[PDB]
Amino acid sequence: ISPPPTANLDRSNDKVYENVTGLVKAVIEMSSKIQPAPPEEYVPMVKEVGLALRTLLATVDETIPLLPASTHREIEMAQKLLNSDLGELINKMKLAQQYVMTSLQQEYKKQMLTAAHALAVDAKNLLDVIDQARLKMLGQT
Ligand SMILES: [Cl-]
Ligand code: NA
């Protein structure tokens, strides 16, 4: 995963976009940091991801009303998905701190990374839905 491409839309005051970039950067940050890190360090990293995720979700809540009825369904479903994904991520994080300095620690991290990476893929996916819904509204041929 890179931070997201920019397609044809102007992103200067694109909040959805800014926030998705935030949440994506935060996942990447955590990932590069994990394997060497004690719990004193990895719990806050995961806190950060949740914050960036809440920020994104409120931004989105505000944008729905401005986009066509036809599109609302998916945008909500794709929202659920990201709450779910974070659910999964916290699970694996509690398991890894439950299992520190044991042998099974590190498969517990491999499961954190797996879930963090779905979170970021699904963020990027939300972006696309939103963009497509805008393009519709702005009147794309
Ligand atoms: Cl916006
Ligand atoms: Na509409």
CSV table of C-alpha atoms and ligand atoms in Angstrom, one decimal:
chain,number,residue,atom,x,y,z
A,1,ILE,CA,0.0,0.0,0.0
A,2,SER,CA,1.1,3.6,-0.9
A,3,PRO,CA,-0.8,6.6,0.5
A,4,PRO,CA,-3.6,7.0,-2.1
A,5,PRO,CA,-3.2,8.3,-5.7
A,6,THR,CA,-4.9,11.7,-6.5
A,7,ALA,CA,-6.9,10.9,-9.8
A,8,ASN,CA,-8.5,14.0,-11.5
A,9,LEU,CA,-10.1,15.6,-8.4
A,10,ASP,CA,-8.6,18.6,-6.7
A,11,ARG,CA,-7.8,17.6,-3.2
A,12,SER,CA,-7.0,21.0,-1.6
A,13,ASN,CA,-10.0,21.0,0.7
A,14,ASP,CA,-10.8,17.3,0.5
A,15,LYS,CA,-11.3,16.2,4.0
A,16,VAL,CA,-12.1,12.6,3.2
A,17,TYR,CA,-9.0,12.3,1.3
A,18,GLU,CA,-6.9,14.1,4.0
A,19,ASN,CA,-8.2,11.7,6.6
A,20,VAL,CA,-7.8,8.6,4.7
A,21,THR,CA,-4.1,9.6,4.1
A,22,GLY,CA,-3.9,10.2,7.9
A,23,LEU,CA,-5.3,6.7,8.8
A,24,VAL,CA,-3.2,5.1,6.2
A,25,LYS,CA,0.1,6.8,7.3
A,26,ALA,CA,-0.8,5.7,10.9
A,27,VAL,CA,-1.1,2.0,10.0
A,28,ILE,CA,2.2,2.1,8.0
A,29,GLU,CA,3.9,3.8,10.9
A,30,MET,CA,2.8,1.2,13.3
A,31,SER,CA,3.8,-1.6,11.0
A,32,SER,CA,7.4,-0.5,10.5
A,33,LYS,CA,7.7,-0.1,14.3
A,34,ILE,CA,6.1,-3.3,15.8
A,35,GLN,CA,8.5,-6.4,15.8
A,36,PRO,CA,11.2,-4.7,18.0
A,37,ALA,CA,8.6,-3.0,20.3
A,38,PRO,CA,7.4,-3.7,23.8
A,39,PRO,CA,3.7,-3.1,24.9
A,40,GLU,CA,4.6,0.3,26.4
A,41,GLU,CA,5.2,1.4,22.8
A,42,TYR,CA,2.7,-0.5,20.7
A,43,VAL,CA,-0.6,0.3,22.6
A,44,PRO,CA,-0.3,4.0,21.9
A,45,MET,CA,0.5,3.3,18.3
A,46,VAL,CA,-2.8,1.4,18.1
A,47,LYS,CA,-4.6,4.2,20.0
A,48,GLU,CA,-3.5,6.5,17.3
A,49,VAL,CA,-4.9,4.4,14.6
A,50,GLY,CA,-8.3,4.4,16.4
A,51,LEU,CA,-8.3,8.2,16.7
A,52,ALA,CA,-7.4,8.7,13.0
A,53,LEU,CA,-10.2,6.3,12.3
A,54,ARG,CA,-12.8,8.0,14.4
A,55,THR,CA,-11.8,11.4,12.8
A,56,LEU,CA,-12.4,9.8,9.3
A,57,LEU,CA,-15.7,8.4,10.2
A,58,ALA,CA,-17.2,11.6,11.5
A,59,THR,CA,-15.9,13.4,8.3
A,60,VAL,CA,-17.7,10.9,6.3
A,61,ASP,CA,-20.9,11.1,8.3
A,62,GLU,CA,-21.0,14.7,7.2
A,63,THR,CA,-20.6,14.1,3.5
A,64,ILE,CA,-23.3,11.5,2.8
A,65,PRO,CA,-26.2,14.1,2.8
A,66,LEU,CA,-24.5,15.8,-0.2
A,67,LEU,CA,-24.2,12.7,-2.4
A,68,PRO,CA,-27.0,10.8,-4.3
A,69,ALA,CA,-29.4,8.4,-2.6
A,70,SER,CA,-28.3,5.5,-4.8
A,71,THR,CA,-24.8,5.6,-3.4
A,72,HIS,CA,-25.6,5.7,0.4
A,73,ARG,CA,-26.0,2.0,0.8
A,74,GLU,CA,-22.3,1.0,0.0
A,75,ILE,CA,-20.8,3.9,1.8
A,76,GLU,CA,-22.5,2.7,4.9
A,77,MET,CA,-21.5,-0.9,4.4
A,78,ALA,CA,-17.9,0.1,3.8
A,79,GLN,CA,-18.0,2.2,7.0
A,80,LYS,CA,-19.1,-0.9,9.0
A,81,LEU,CA,-16.3,-2.8,7.6
A,82,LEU,CA,-13.7,-0.4,8.9
A,83,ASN,CA,-15.2,-0.6,12.5
A,84,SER,CA,-15.1,-4.4,12.2
A,85,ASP,CA,-11.4,-4.2,11.0
A,86,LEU,CA,-10.4,-2.2,14.0
A,87,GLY,CA,-12.3,-4.6,16.2
A,88,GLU,CA,-10.1,-7.4,14.8
A,89,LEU,CA,-7.0,-5.4,15.3
A,90,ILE,CA,-7.6,-4.7,19.0
A,91,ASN,CA,-8.2,-8.4,19.6
A,92,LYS,CA,-4.8,-9.4,18.2
A,93,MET,CA,-3.1,-6.6,20.2
A,94,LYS,CA,-4.5,-7.9,23.5
A,95,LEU,CA,-3.4,-11.4,22.6
A,96,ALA,CA,0.1,-10.2,22.0
A,97,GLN,CA,0.4,-8.4,25.3
A,98,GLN,CA,-1.2,-11.4,27.0
A,99,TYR,CA,1.7,-13.5,25.5
A,100,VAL,CA,4.8,-11.3,26.0
A,101,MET,CA,8.3,-13.0,26.3
A,102,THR,CA,6.7,-16.3,25.5
A,103,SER,CA,7.2,-18.0,22.2
A,104,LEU,CA,3.8,-17.3,20.6
A,105,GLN,CA,4.3,-13.5,20.8
A,106,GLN,CA,5.4,-13.2,17.4
A,107,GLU,CA,2.8,-15.0,15.6
A,108,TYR,CA,0.6,-12.7,17.6
A,109,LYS,CA,2.3,-9.7,15.9
A,110,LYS,CA,1.9,-11.4,12.5
A,111,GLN,CA,-1.8,-11.2,13.1
A,112,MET,CA,-1.8,-7.6,14.1
A,113,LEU,CA,0.0,-6.7,10.8
A,114,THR,CA,-2.5,-8.8,8.9
A,115,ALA,CA,-5.4,-6.9,10.4
A,116,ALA,CA,-3.8,-3.4,10.2
A,117,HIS,CA,-3.2,-4.1,6.5
A,118,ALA,CA,-6.9,-4.9,5.9
A,119,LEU,CA,-7.9,-1.7,7.7
A,120,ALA,CA,-5.7,0.3,5.3
A,121,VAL,CA,-7.0,-1.6,2.2
A,122,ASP,CA,-10.6,-0.9,3.2
A,123,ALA,CA,-9.9,2.8,3.9
A,124,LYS,CA,-8.6,3.1,0.3
A,125,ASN,CA,-11.6,1.3,-0.8
A,126,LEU,CA,-13.9,3.8,0.9
A,127,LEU,CA,-12.1,6.6,-0.9
A,128,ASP,CA,-13.1,5.1,-4.2
A,129,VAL,CA,-16.7,4.8,-3.4
A,130,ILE,CA,-16.8,8.4,-2.2
A,131,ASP,CA,-15.0,9.6,-5.3
A,132,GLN,CA,-17.3,7.7,-7.6
A,133,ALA,CA,-20.2,9.2,-5.7
A,134,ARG,CA,-18.8,12.7,-6.1
A,135,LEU,CA,-18.1,12.2,-9.8
A,136,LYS,CA,-21.7,11.3,-10.3
A,137,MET,CA,-22.9,14.4,-8.5
A,138,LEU,CA,-20.4,16.8,-10.2
A,139,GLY,CA,-21.8,15.4,-13.4
A,140,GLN,CA,-19.0,13.2,-15.0
A,141,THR,CA,-19.6,11.9,-18.7
B,1,CL,CL,-14.7,16.9,2.2
B,2,NA,NA,-29.8,12.0,-4.5
